[PDB]
Subunit: 208 residues, 4 copies
């Protein structure tokens, strides 16, 4: 069968990744990372395609971007930049507003979400693991009666049968733990450019 492109870029279980010594990375993490799972540049290239897909699907009306902090911030900043790039340099434009929330399910911060009523909402999230977080978030947002909700997740783990399938998925990754590109381990590694797998040394060094 032809691929299901809705899965995003498929990173296989036997993917060895890229060797950190061949790329640049924050020097304070020297010795703390095992390998590069997804280089920064491939993330940006993939986001270019997602932005084009999103514009096709929901560019016909205003978009309310809802960033899921903190891990979503880089994917949201870059995705928004790509959408902006289209709205100014092509024939196709979309008015965007942006908001930011943190999840505890309690939603922390953000505007009064009654402002979402009748609007097209694009949730921007870092990674789907079990899918429980996204299912709960959708259930909470749906109560404000937006016109539609789309979920973009940079990463989706391959696991279970009760997963969550985002509308826009960057990469489908093995069921392992990832950091970088704003994703953290105990608040560290958000400043790392590439998505990486930490090594055992890093796991202990940054342990709480």
């Amino acid at each position: 069968e032809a691929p299901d492109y809705g899965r995003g870029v498929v990173i296989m279980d036997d993917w060895p990744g890229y060797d950190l010594n061949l790329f640049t990375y924050p020097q304070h993490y020297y010795g703390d990372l095992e390998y590069v799972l997804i280089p920064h540049g491939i993330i940006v290239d993939r986001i270019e395609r997602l932005a084009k897909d999103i514009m096709k699907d929901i560019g016909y009306s205003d978009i309310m971007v809802l960033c899921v902090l903190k891990g979503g911030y880089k994917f949201c900043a870059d995705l928004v930049e790509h959408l902006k790039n289209i709205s100014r340099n092509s024939d196709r434009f979309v008015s965007m507003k942006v908001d930011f929330i943190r999840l505890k399910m309690q939603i922390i911060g953000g505007d009064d979400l009654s402002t979402l009523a009748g609007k097209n909402v694009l949730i921007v999230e870092d990674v789907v693991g079990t899918g429980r977080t996204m299912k709960a978030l959708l259930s909470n947002i749906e109560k404000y009666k937006p016109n539609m909700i789309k979920v973009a997740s940079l990463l989706v783990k391959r696991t279970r049968s009760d997963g969550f399938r985002p509308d826009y998925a960057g990469f489908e990754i093995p069921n392992l733990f990832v950091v970088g590109y704003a994703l953290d381990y105990n608040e560290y590694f958000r400043d790392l450019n590439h998505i990486c797998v930490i090594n055992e040394h890093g796991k202990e060094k940054y342990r709480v």
Copy 2:
């Protein structure tokens, strides 16, 4: 006298700005903007210098970046990228953590700010007008006893004698109202790339 470079790039009262027809911008704002005050690219060039200055001053230890949402998000994303660029491509590196707050003074969202105790905090803000907001914020953050607090503001208006002087200031602008580069008018114009002065048509079109 030689210039006070702490003022940042000085945009004079008689600055005519740049004509929108010579640049790109979100097409949904066609007819809604008067002129470009500060092109996107000059903002990025200035941030490059600020990042270098910040690394000189406080790169010697970990930096806790505190983004003042929503208007600070683009300046914070770009400033962080420039700091990251230094931490990976030069000889000088700094570990950064990031957090996000909204101001109401109540601080909305963010981590437990007791985690700021004994740390070096870099507040990242969009624009200083009267300076009241930054003075109040500093007074609130100081109560958690960080080791030091630095304030980066992209813009500072030239006004009063009781102003606030940020540690890092991008541009000193005339005392007028600005949007773009995440700065809004009634939630609009955050997706505009350049910092602009809205025209009378835009003021009415987007009025609440």
Copy 3:
């Protein structure tokens, strides 16, 4: 008003202070001020690309880069055209070529121009040609090049120049209209120096002497 002139930089433009920006450390003390920051050049190129795509989209174009000074403007203009072509419903299919110009006088004092490098320019017959150049001064260089290319019977020739001096030749696409000053940076040189400078700048007397031939 006349947008064909591009961004107008006025004679009393004081420019930007180097101390507020980053620049090559090896040129500290050689430059007087920034005439045009790197970032505004990129912003302006974005619009030139959009303008070019409006005029010649859905066609094949041969981009002809005038080395050496044109290389940075050409690389960036081409990237912006590529951007539109993959991210919008308009494209240009691009080929690229590179030429260097050497102007001289013959035995009766007639100006001649040798075109160095490049493909066999007979390959331009019936093609759409976009010349990409750094700066128009007197305009003599672009007038000579145009007549050289025109003899191969291209379908059309358009000229993009990053800078045009106020003193003439009018390019189809002009980034900035600048005072009549010698400028360097963004690949533009003084005696092969300063091409690695990011911002378009004016050099001081120390820089003029230090890098003199």
Copy 4:
């Protein structure tokens, strides 16, 4: 292990599916798959620049771009070197030149190489030269170029090549070590097409026929 080989792309590398990325619409249906996405090329160039700065920082270098295929790798490598030079305490002072190579056989079947364009290469005497090239195949081109430059007595010559094929010549700086396949994109061409393609790709049989000479 041997990091001098660069990023190793294996023979059973399936590449990336074009349908998951953006690319020039005019090439839809001409390409089989993405061998190396644009973004990983940029990431790798970042590290090559850092490596080069470690080896030759605080010195003057002449960057020698091998046109046409080298232009994109050279523009981007140079931008990354410029980045370090203004944002760190190490710099290289750079000049740039451009050459095109034409290989032929003489009347006794000896391989010759004409160097087209460029400065008078006598100006390389005592200089540090960084050659920037797109791809090493058999290595014959780089061996010929090196011996041509060496006769002008430069202080040193280093070679950066974006791609090196497994089949030899070993550049000082190599981006990626690739299977022995014909590749295009990132300025690399097939019969002058595909230079405007963003990603390094392998073309299909339709593309091979359509753009044949």
